[PDB]
Design a binder for this molecule. Structure first.
Ligand SMILES: Cc1c(NC(=O)c2ccc(C(C)(C)C)cc2)cccc1-c1cn(C)c(=O)c(Nc2ccc(C(=O)N3CCOCC3)cc2)n1
Length: 266
Protein backbone atom coordinates (compact mmCIF):
# COMPACT_ATOMS: atom_id res chain seq x y z
CA UNK A 1 0.00 0.00 0.00
CA UNK A 2 2.22 2.69 1.36
CA UNK A 3 4.90 0.08 0.86
CA UNK A 4 6.57 0.79 -2.45
CA UNK A 5 8.54 -1.89 -4.29
CA UNK A 6 11.99 -0.44 -5.02
CA UNK A 7 11.99 -2.49 -8.23
CA UNK A 8 9.39 -0.01 -9.47
CA UNK A 9 11.78 2.92 -9.01
CA UNK A 10 14.11 4.39 -11.58
CA UNK A 11 16.75 6.81 -10.38
CA UNK A 12 17.27 9.57 -12.93
CA UNK A 13 19.06 12.57 -11.39
CA UNK A 14 20.60 13.64 -8.17
CA UNK A 15 18.84 16.56 -6.49
CA UNK A 16 21.31 17.16 -3.67
CA UNK A 17 21.93 16.22 -0.08
CA UNK A 18 20.07 17.03 3.13
CA UNK A 19 20.06 15.94 6.73
CA UNK A 20 19.23 12.36 5.76
CA UNK A 21 21.62 12.14 2.80
CA UNK A 22 21.08 12.01 -0.93
CA UNK A 23 17.80 12.83 -2.62
CA UNK A 24 17.09 11.85 -6.23
CA UNK A 25 14.58 12.56 -8.95
CA UNK A 26 13.13 9.47 -10.53
CA UNK A 27 10.16 7.66 -11.94
CA UNK A 28 7.79 5.15 -10.43
CA UNK A 29 6.94 2.46 -12.97
CA UNK A 30 8.64 4.57 -15.60
CA UNK A 31 5.83 7.04 -15.81
CA UNK A 32 5.22 8.97 -12.62
CA UNK A 33 7.68 11.65 -11.41
CA UNK A 34 8.87 11.21 -7.84
CA UNK A 35 11.57 12.34 -5.45
CA UNK A 36 13.35 9.66 -3.45
CA UNK A 37 15.19 10.23 -0.22
CA UNK A 38 17.81 7.47 -0.05
CA UNK A 39 18.31 7.56 3.65
CA UNK A 40 21.92 7.52 4.79
CA UNK A 41 22.99 4.92 7.34
CA UNK A 42 23.02 6.45 10.78
CA UNK A 43 21.21 9.67 9.87
CA UNK A 44 17.69 8.71 10.91
CA UNK A 45 15.84 6.74 13.53
CA UNK A 46 14.06 4.69 10.92
CA UNK A 47 12.04 2.42 13.18
CA UNK A 48 9.99 5.26 14.67
CA UNK A 49 9.66 6.99 11.31
CA UNK A 50 8.19 3.85 9.71
CA UNK A 51 5.47 3.78 12.34
CA UNK A 52 4.81 7.49 12.05
CA UNK A 53 4.70 7.22 8.24
CA UNK A 54 1.38 5.41 8.74
CA UNK A 55 -0.09 8.70 10.05
CA UNK A 56 1.74 10.90 7.60
CA UNK A 57 0.30 8.90 4.65
CA UNK A 58 -3.06 10.37 5.59
CA UNK A 59 -1.83 13.97 5.41
CA UNK A 60 -3.00 15.16 2.05
CA UNK A 61 -3.22 18.78 1.06
CA UNK A 62 -2.36 20.39 -2.25
CA UNK A 63 0.19 22.71 -0.56
CA UNK A 64 1.90 19.90 1.40
CA UNK A 65 4.57 17.93 -0.40
CA UNK A 66 2.86 14.58 -0.73
CA UNK A 67 4.21 11.39 0.79
CA UNK A 68 3.70 8.62 -1.75
CA UNK A 69 5.21 5.79 0.27
CA UNK A 70 8.22 4.11 1.78
CA UNK A 71 10.55 1.26 0.87
CA UNK A 72 11.02 -0.59 4.15
CA UNK A 73 11.89 -4.19 3.21
CA UNK A 74 15.46 -3.01 2.90
CA UNK A 75 17.69 -0.89 4.99
CA UNK A 76 18.28 1.92 5.03
CA UNK A 77 14.84 2.87 3.75
CA UNK A 78 13.74 5.05 0.86
CA UNK A 79 11.10 7.79 1.30
CA UNK A 80 9.14 8.55 -1.89
CA UNK A 81 7.40 11.86 -2.39
CA UNK A 82 5.97 14.30 -4.83
CA UNK A 83 8.61 15.94 -7.07
CA UNK A 84 9.06 19.73 -6.98
CA UNK A 85 10.90 20.90 -10.08
CA UNK A 86 12.05 24.26 -8.83
CA UNK A 87 13.68 23.00 -5.66
CA UNK A 88 14.09 24.90 -2.42
CA UNK A 89 12.08 28.09 -1.87
CA UNK A 90 15.12 29.74 -0.35
CA UNK A 91 17.20 29.29 -3.52
CA UNK A 92 14.20 30.13 -5.71
CA UNK A 93 13.78 33.48 -3.95
CA UNK A 94 17.48 34.28 -4.27
CA UNK A 95 17.53 33.43 -7.99
CA UNK A 96 14.24 35.18 -8.88
CA UNK A 97 14.79 38.21 -6.68
CA UNK A 98 14.09 41.01 -9.18
CA UNK A 99 11.47 39.03 -11.08
CA UNK A 100 8.75 38.94 -8.41
CA UNK A 101 5.85 41.34 -8.14
CA UNK A 102 4.71 41.91 -4.54
CA UNK A 103 1.39 40.20 -5.38
CA UNK A 104 3.41 37.10 -6.22
CA UNK A 105 5.23 37.21 -2.87
CA UNK A 106 1.95 37.31 -0.96
CA UNK A 107 0.53 34.37 -2.91
CA UNK A 108 3.62 32.35 -1.90
CA UNK A 109 2.88 33.24 1.72
CA UNK A 110 -0.72 32.17 1.20
CA UNK A 111 0.39 28.79 -0.22
CA UNK A 112 2.41 28.03 2.91
CA UNK A 113 -0.33 29.31 5.21
CA UNK A 114 -2.87 26.94 3.53
CA UNK A 115 -0.57 23.99 4.19
CA UNK A 116 -0.04 25.02 7.78
CA UNK A 117 -3.74 25.63 8.42
CA UNK A 118 -4.25 22.03 7.31
CA UNK A 119 -1.53 20.71 9.60
CA UNK A 120 -2.94 22.78 12.46
CA UNK A 121 -6.38 21.24 11.85
CA UNK A 122 -4.69 17.83 12.25
CA UNK A 123 -2.79 18.88 15.40
CA UNK A 124 0.41 18.11 13.52
CA UNK A 125 3.53 20.20 14.16
CA UNK A 126 6.11 21.02 11.56
CA UNK A 127 8.88 21.85 14.08
CA UNK A 128 11.34 23.32 11.51
CA UNK A 129 9.29 25.63 9.32
CA UNK A 130 11.51 27.95 7.24
CA UNK A 131 11.98 28.80 3.56
CA UNK A 132 14.70 26.14 3.33
CA UNK A 133 12.01 23.57 4.15
CA UNK A 134 9.57 24.67 1.48
CA UNK A 135 9.79 23.53 -2.14
CA UNK A 136 8.57 25.07 -5.41
CA UNK A 137 7.05 23.21 -8.36
CA UNK A 138 6.68 23.99 -12.06
CA UNK A 139 3.72 26.25 -11.41
CA UNK A 140 5.70 28.44 -9.03
CA UNK A 141 3.57 26.96 -6.23
CA UNK A 142 5.17 26.73 -2.81
CA UNK A 143 4.60 23.57 -0.78
CA UNK A 144 5.67 22.70 2.75
CA UNK A 145 8.19 19.86 3.07
CA UNK A 146 9.53 17.53 5.78
CA UNK A 147 6.91 18.44 8.32
CA UNK A 148 7.39 16.49 11.55
CA UNK A 149 10.68 15.03 10.37
CA UNK A 150 12.85 16.68 13.05
CA UNK A 151 11.64 13.88 15.32
CA UNK A 152 13.79 11.32 13.55
CA UNK A 153 17.09 13.18 13.21
CA UNK A 154 20.18 11.56 14.75
CA UNK A 155 22.47 14.58 14.96
CA UNK A 156 23.11 16.24 18.30
CA UNK A 157 24.20 19.50 16.66
CA UNK A 158 20.70 19.74 15.15
CA UNK A 159 18.43 18.36 17.87
CA UNK A 160 20.00 20.34 20.74
CA UNK A 161 19.05 24.02 21.02
CA UNK A 162 22.71 24.69 21.84
CA UNK A 163 23.91 22.87 18.73
CA UNK A 164 25.41 24.56 15.69
CA UNK A 165 22.61 23.33 13.44
CA UNK A 166 19.55 24.08 15.60
CA UNK A 167 17.23 26.56 13.82
CA UNK A 168 17.58 29.23 16.49
CA UNK A 169 16.67 32.14 14.23
CA UNK A 170 13.21 30.64 13.49
CA UNK A 171 12.54 29.56 17.10
CA UNK A 172 10.05 31.19 19.44
CA UNK A 173 11.19 32.22 22.91
CA UNK A 174 9.44 29.28 24.61
CA UNK A 175 11.21 26.85 22.27
CA UNK A 176 14.56 28.38 23.12
CA UNK A 177 13.86 28.59 26.87
CA UNK A 178 11.81 25.45 27.51
CA UNK A 179 11.77 23.33 24.32
CA UNK A 180 8.00 23.95 24.28
CA UNK A 181 6.75 23.12 20.77
CA UNK A 182 3.18 23.80 19.70
CA UNK A 183 1.23 25.14 16.72
CA UNK A 184 2.14 28.55 18.24
CA UNK A 185 5.89 27.91 17.76
CA UNK A 186 5.07 26.93 14.15
CA UNK A 187 3.22 30.29 13.92
CA UNK A 188 6.33 32.15 15.07
CA UNK A 189 8.45 30.37 12.47
CA UNK A 190 5.88 31.14 9.76
CA UNK A 191 6.27 34.83 10.50
CA UNK A 192 10.01 34.49 9.98
CA UNK A 193 9.32 32.56 6.73
CA UNK A 194 7.09 35.43 5.51
CA UNK A 195 10.00 37.76 6.28
CA UNK A 196 12.30 35.52 4.26
CA UNK A 197 9.92 35.68 1.29
CA UNK A 198 9.57 39.45 1.37
CA UNK A 199 13.35 39.81 1.84
CA UNK A 200 13.94 37.59 -1.22
CA UNK A 201 15.82 35.02 0.81
CA UNK A 202 17.94 37.14 3.13
CA UNK A 203 19.04 35.40 6.30
CA UNK A 204 17.10 36.66 9.33
CA UNK A 205 19.26 38.28 12.02
CA UNK A 206 22.23 37.82 9.69
CA UNK A 207 24.47 40.06 11.84
CA UNK A 208 23.78 38.05 15.00
CA UNK A 209 25.07 34.88 16.54
CA UNK A 210 22.45 32.41 17.78
CA UNK A 211 22.98 33.50 21.37
CA UNK A 212 22.68 37.18 20.37
CA UNK A 213 19.41 36.31 18.57
CA UNK A 214 17.99 34.52 21.62
CA UNK A 215 18.79 37.52 23.78
CA UNK A 216 17.36 39.91 21.15
CA UNK A 217 13.98 38.19 20.96
CA UNK A 218 13.88 37.76 24.75
CA UNK A 219 14.02 41.55 25.13
CA UNK A 220 11.05 42.02 22.81
CA UNK A 221 13.05 42.87 19.69
CA UNK A 222 12.06 41.56 16.27
CA UNK A 223 12.79 41.68 12.54
CA UNK A 224 12.45 44.90 10.56
CA UNK A 225 10.02 45.48 7.72
CA UNK A 226 11.31 44.41 4.29
CA UNK A 227 10.51 47.33 2.02
CA UNK A 228 8.61 45.13 -0.44
CA UNK A 229 6.17 44.41 2.39
CA UNK A 230 3.43 46.95 2.98
CA UNK A 231 2.45 47.72 6.56
CA UNK A 232 -0.54 45.40 6.05
CA UNK A 233 1.72 42.52 5.07
CA UNK A 234 4.23 43.34 7.81
CA UNK A 235 1.41 43.40 10.37
CA UNK A 236 0.65 39.76 9.50
CA UNK A 237 4.20 38.49 9.93
CA UNK A 238 4.67 40.65 13.04
CA UNK A 239 1.55 39.24 14.68
CA UNK A 240 3.25 35.86 14.65
CA UNK A 241 5.86 37.07 17.11
CA UNK A 242 3.79 37.85 20.20
CA UNK A 243 5.81 37.12 23.29
CA UNK A 244 2.89 35.13 24.70
CA UNK A 245 2.24 32.07 22.57
CA UNK A 246 -1.49 32.08 23.29
CA UNK A 247 -1.77 35.62 21.84
CA UNK A 248 -0.40 34.53 18.51
CA UNK A 249 -3.02 33.99 15.84
CA UNK A 250 -3.92 30.62 14.43
CA UNK A 251 -3.08 29.71 10.83
CA UNK A 252 -6.82 29.91 10.09
CA UNK A 253 -6.79 33.54 11.20
CA UNK A 254 -3.53 34.25 9.38
CA UNK A 255 -4.94 32.84 6.15
CA UNK A 256 -8.02 35.07 6.40
CA UNK A 257 -5.72 38.03 7.00
CA UNK A 258 -3.55 37.19 3.99
CA UNK A 259 -6.60 36.83 1.74
CA UNK A 260 -7.90 40.21 2.98
CA UNK A 261 -4.66 41.85 1.96
CA UNK A 262 -4.54 40.03 -1.39
CA UNK A 263 -7.90 41.66 -2.17
CA UNK A 264 -6.78 45.06 -0.99
CA UNK A 265 -3.49 45.18 -2.82
CA UNK A 266 -4.80 43.67 -6.08
C1 LIG B 1 14.02 18.01 0.53
C2 LIG B 1 15.40 17.87 -0.13
C3 LIG B 1 16.58 17.88 0.61
N1 LIG B 1 16.41 18.04 2.04
C4 LIG B 1 16.00 16.94 2.84
O1 LIG B 1 15.85 15.84 2.39
C5 LIG B 1 15.75 17.24 4.31
C6 LIG B 1 15.75 16.26 5.26
C7 LIG B 1 15.47 16.56 6.59
C8 LIG B 1 15.15 17.87 6.97
C9 LIG B 1 14.86 18.23 8.43
C10 LIG B 1 16.13 18.88 8.98
C11 LIG B 1 13.68 19.18 8.60
C12 LIG B 1 14.58 16.97 9.24
C13 LIG B 1 15.13 18.86 6.00
C14 LIG B 1 15.41 18.54 4.67
C15 LIG B 1 17.82 17.82 0.01
C16 LIG B 1 17.90 17.72 -1.37
C17 LIG B 1 16.75 17.69 -2.14
C18 LIG B 1 15.52 17.77 -1.51
C19 LIG B 1 14.35 17.74 -2.44
C20 LIG B 1 13.08 17.01 -2.14
N2 LIG B 1 12.01 17.01 -3.13
C21 LIG B 1 10.79 16.34 -2.80
C22 LIG B 1 12.21 17.70 -4.36
O2 LIG B 1 11.36 17.71 -5.19
C23 LIG B 1 13.49 18.41 -4.62
N3 LIG B 1 13.58 19.09 -5.86
C24 LIG B 1 14.69 19.77 -6.44
C25 LIG B 1 14.46 20.17 -7.75
C26 LIG B 1 15.46 20.82 -8.42
C27 LIG B 1 16.67 21.03 -7.80
C28 LIG B 1 17.80 21.74 -8.58
O3 LIG B 1 18.85 21.19 -8.69
N4 LIG B 1 17.55 23.05 -9.18
C29 LIG B 1 16.31 23.77 -9.09
C30 LIG B 1 15.77 24.35 -10.39
O4 LIG B 1 16.76 24.92 -11.22
C31 LIG B 1 17.98 24.21 -11.30
C32 LIG B 1 18.53 23.78 -9.95
C33 LIG B 1 16.92 20.60 -6.52
C34 LIG B 1 15.93 19.95 -5.82
N5 LIG B 1 14.54 18.47 -3.66
Amino acid sequence: AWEIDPKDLTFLKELGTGQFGVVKYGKWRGQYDVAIKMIKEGSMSEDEFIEEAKVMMNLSHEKLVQLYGVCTKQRPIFIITEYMANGCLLNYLREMRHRFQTQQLLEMCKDVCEAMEYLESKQFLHRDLAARNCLVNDQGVVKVSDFGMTRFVLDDEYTSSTGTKFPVKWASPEVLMYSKFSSKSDIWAFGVLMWEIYSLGKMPYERFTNSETAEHIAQGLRLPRPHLASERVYAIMYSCWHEKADERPTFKILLSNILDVMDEES
